[PDB]
């Protein structure tokens, strides 16, 4: 039922007149997002099957709903931007966001390793064009080149890995078919078989090493602070790690042991750099490394508790970090430079936005249980069963998560703004709508997030 309404969103933008466009693209996507919450939430004893494998089913995917929720939310943010540009290019651009969401529907629904991978790499091309065009800053080409240099050099090793496994054992295709799984005997030939499957999802899931892929894409932003939400979807786009570790190699996880250790310093040293940096977007970009590092620590332990925390964190980060980029968008559209020291002063000009600043910053910390505490606390309790010493390393991260939020608040709480003559008008009706449509689903998930953290829960 999710094939050919997003494909029917494609001719909608082209056929509609120049006066409309934005009114049609948003309204005919909100009712599509209503149907995802209507049908996909149902589960039996185990994983179902909606149709024959073109798009399969859901096992532990309420993350599909999040992409459908961001299906109109990106169009909300890019309203002040692309208002002075050509009308034909507006029709060209919305279709490129739709095409991203088209393949994103496919990747989460399809329970394959072969069909998933080629449509996982089909999200790379639209983002490349979205980054390298309409980029407000210079040297945006480095953000484009390294986007496909880091990812493809790690992901093309999947072709030599995935096809090798299906040549030996049956076929990967149906996944629920793949329970012919033989335990990996830990040989030197199997060393690179494990590494090639992981390294593809060591780039999009940022570690300490090979992590420069992320901040360059955010500092040299695709569009101001509007199309960054698609890059948040690429962060949670590395959900194949949940499927590869579980199915393809359950016995041999001795090679996972150094990768947890590499991501353990991808918690402290990635949070240390995120304290002095001048760019407001980079202060979200480096914080997004640490919160997504939590999942990489969790998955490789392979305990049932870690999967509960990880699946929660994938949804938690997808609505909290993206909300922080919307706050960075609102500051950049007025000042036109993302310097934190320059843009200083809330409440004197922006009274209502200051409360939305709090409901977005403090969610990086463990508030009264939204989804972030539920995401983090299960992972920390999972790391103790792994090893007792972890909470000493994890506890330092809990201190610097306060140094994320409050430092973003204090540098905006200092009432001055002497040099600023702009930012006269407080906020548009669509501007405050972005603050509500990101936070209120998090506030509704405080009550019962049973249909959020669900890998057999």
């Amino acid at each position: 039922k999710y094939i050919i309404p997003t494909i029917m969103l494609m001719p909608l933008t082209w056929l509609s007149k120049n006066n409309m466009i934005w009114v049609n693209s948003t309204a005919h996507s909100l009712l599509i997002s209503f149907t995802s919450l209507l049908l996909m939430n149902q589960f039996g004893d185990n994983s179902l099957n909606f149709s024959l494998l073109f798009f399969s089913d859901s096992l532990s995917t309420p993350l599909l709903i999040l992409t459908m929720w961001l299906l109109p939310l990106m169009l909300m943010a890019s309203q002040h931007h692309l208002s002075k540009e050509n009308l034909t290019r507006k029709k060209l651009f919305i279709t490129m966001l739709i095409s991203l969401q088209l393949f994103l529907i496919m990747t989460f629904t399809a329970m394959e390793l072969i069909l998933f991978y080629i449509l996982f790499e089909a999200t790379l091309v639209p983002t490349l064009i979205i980054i390298t065009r309409w980029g407000n800053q210079t040297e945006r080409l480095n953000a484009g080149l390294y986007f496909l240099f880091y990812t493809l050099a790690g992901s093309l090793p999947l072709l030599v890995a995935l096809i090798y496994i299906q040549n030996t054992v049956g076929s990967l295709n149906f996944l629920m078919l793949q329970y012919w799984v033989q335990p990996v005997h830990n040989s030197w030939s199997n060393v690179f078989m494990w590494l090639a499957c992981m390294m593809a999802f060591m780039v999009k899931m940022p570690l300490y090493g090979l992590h420069l892929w992320l901040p360059k894409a955010h500092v040299e932003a695709p569009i101001a602070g509007s199309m960054v939400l698609a890059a948040v979807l690429l962060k949670l786009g590395g959900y194949g790690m949940l499927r590869i570790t579980l199915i393809l190699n359950p016995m041999t996880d001795f090679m996972a042991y150094p990768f947890i250790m590499l991501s353990l310093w991808g918690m402290i040293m990635t949070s240390s750099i995120c304290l002095r940096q001048t760019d407001l977007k980079s202060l979200i970009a480096y914080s997004s490394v640490s919160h997504m590092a939590l999942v990489i620590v969790a998955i490789l332990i392979q305990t049932p508790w870690s999967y509960m925390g990880a699946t929660a964190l994938m949804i938690a980060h997808g609505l909290t970090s993206s909300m922080l980029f919307c706050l960075a968008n609102s500051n950049y559209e007025r000042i036109h430079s993302r310097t934190m020291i320059l843009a200083r002063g809330l409440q004197t000009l922006l009274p209502l936005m200051a409360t939305w600043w709090l409901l977005a910053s403090l969610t990086n910390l463990a508030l009264p249980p939204t989804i972030n505490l539920i995401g983090e606390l299960f992972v920390v309790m999972s790391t103790f069963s792994w090893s007792n010493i972890t909470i000493i390393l994890m506890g330092v991260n809990m201190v610097i998560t306060a140094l994320y939020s409050l430092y973003m608040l204090i540098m905006t709480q200092r009432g001055k703004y002497t040099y600023h003559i702009n930012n006269i008008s407080p906020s548009f009706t669509r501007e405050n709508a972005l603050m509500s449509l990101h936070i209120l689903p998090l506030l509704l998930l405080t009550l019962n997030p049973k249909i959020i953290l669900g890998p057999l829960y």
Partner: protein
């Protein structure tokens, strides 16, 4: 003794000849191993593409 042909020979047949039988394998030693058996019967679609999809 005088007999002259004004036409030629034009391949004359010897029916009176017996001597030895003609088929006795003049050069052949091995019969050569039997070729691949020809598949009889119409083909039916069962799997419908054994590729990665469909």
């Amino acid at each position: 003794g005088w007999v002259r042909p004004d036409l030629g020979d034009l391949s004359k047949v010897t029916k009176v000849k017996t001597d030895r039988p003609l088929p006795e394998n003049p050069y052949h030693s091995r019969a050569r191993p039997e070729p691949n058996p020809e598949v009889e019967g119409d083909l039916k679609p069962a799997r419908h593409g054994s590729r990665l999809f469909f």
